[PDB]
């Protein structure tokens, strides 16, 4: 019902393969990209996993 | 212990009959009595039981707890379980040597229509 | 005769305890069977001076939390491995 906005603030050059896939799961492509995803315990579990390259506005 | 040594003497046959998932006819023997009961493949609940302590059987018996007594209870078990639809059971020794009253208990039950 | 002041800990855990210990305070708890246990925090410099006394572990103490006096006895003490410091002290509601 409520959408949540996620912005990538750091690059994904030397990251673990489990954090490159999380960004693909969220949909982020390059630093500065902002996507509007649905709020969900599964979606917020991706944000927590990579909560050093992404910035969530709320 | 005289009973504990017998209990572990009958465990292997008793657990195989449960893994096999077959109805079994456990037989308990006493120097003064003899018991028999048909226990479901579950192992927890019984279907048919007949024993020398039953007053319907003991009054016709000169001395409950001999070969002639074991023959009477075996007939009772088989006929009691015949109207219940149980025909295919497996005999359980319960550790007693299949040689005396248990043999007559089985033989009379075997002859009375039960198939095992 | 020993009276020590303490406050109820808002947050507990490994991370929150090490922040307490860097501010000259260390955690403690009070458990007495028929009542729920109470986790407290109390200053380190004050209690380390008294705990050197031989009577600290024998005498019934008194703890002033939220204004209420609780009479306790020192059950166990966790010391720093190689420093004259404390890490955790168990009070039983005696």
């Amino acid at each position: 019902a409520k959408t949540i906005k996620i912005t990538q603030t750091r690059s994904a050059i030397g990251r673990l393969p489990k954090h490159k896939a999380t960004l693909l799961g969220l949909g982020l492509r390059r630093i500065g990209h902002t996507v509007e995803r649905e709020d969900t315990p599964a979606i917020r579990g991706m944000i927590n996993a990579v909560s050093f390259m992404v910035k969530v506005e709320e | 212990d005289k009973k504990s040594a017998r209990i572990r003497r009958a465990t292997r046959a008793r657990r195989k009959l449960q893994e096999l998932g077959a109805t079994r006819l456990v037989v308990h023997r006493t120097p003064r009595h003899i018991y028999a009961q048909v226990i479901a493949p579950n192992g927890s609940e019984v279907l048919v039981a007949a024993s020398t302590v039953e007053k319907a059987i003991a009054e016709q018996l000169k001395y409950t707890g001999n070969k002639d007594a074991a023959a009477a209870v075996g007939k009772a078990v088989a006929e009691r379980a015949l109207e219940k639809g149980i025909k295919d059971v497996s005999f359980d020794r319960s550790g007693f040597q299949y040689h005396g009253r248990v043999q007559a208990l089985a033989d009379a039950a075997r002859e009375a229509g039960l198939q095992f | 005769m020993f009276t020590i002041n303490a406050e109820v800990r808002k947050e507990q855990g490994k991370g929150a305890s090490r922040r307490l210990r860097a501010a000259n305070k260390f955690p403690a708890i009070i458990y007495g069977g028929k009542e729920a246990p109470l986790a407290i925090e109390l200053d380190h410099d004050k209690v380390m001076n008294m705990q050197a006394k031989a009577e600290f572990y024998s005498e019934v103490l008194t703890i002033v939390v939220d204004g209420k006096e609780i009479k306790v006895k020192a059950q166990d003490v966790q010391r720093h491995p190689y420093k004259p410091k404390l890490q955790h002290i168990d009070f039983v509601r005696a």
């Binding site: - | - | 600290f56 572990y57 166990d76 003490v77 010391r79 491995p81 190689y82």
Partner: protein
């Protein structure tokens, strides 16, 4: 010289040395020499620091050594290339973590105990400290 007799295996892995020690309090005597540093401490330094202690007091009290090497250390010979097996065991070391109580003694005044432990603390590589018995 402290050294295990009848060990299960001749040679033992190098391993690592992490964490704090277990015997961090005086349990037999009343004054103890407690480590603050880290590092293996051979059997030759254990005896060299015991002699400096049974000579400072020289008549009184009992002394407990709360460490035992039980760790074989192998050294390669000289002018030998690498490989071709493991070295031949040379000495034995007692791995020490901070907080371990190495020596401790009872039966002497604290001033004599304090100075005697200072004579042994100058023969051990690690940084030691003086600790006294508590109540718990």
């Amino acid at each position: 010289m402290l050294q295990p007799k009848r060990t299960k295996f001749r040679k033992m892995h190098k391993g690592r040395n992490r964490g704090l020690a277990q015997g961090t309090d005086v349990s037999f005597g009343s004054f103890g020499l407690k480590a603050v540093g880290r590092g293996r401490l051979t059997a030759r330094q254990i005896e060299a620091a015991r002699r400096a202690m049974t000579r400072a007091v020289k008549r009184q009290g009992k002394i407990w050594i709360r460490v035992f090497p039980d760790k074989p250390i192998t050294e390669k010979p000289l002018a030998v290339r690498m490989g071709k097996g493991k070295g031949n065991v040379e000495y034995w070391v007692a791995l020490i973590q901070p907080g371990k109580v190495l020596y401790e003694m009872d039966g002497v005044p604290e001033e004599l105990a304090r100075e005697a432990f200072k004579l042994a603390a100058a023969k051990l590589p690690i940084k030691t400290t003086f600790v006294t018995k508590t109540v718990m």
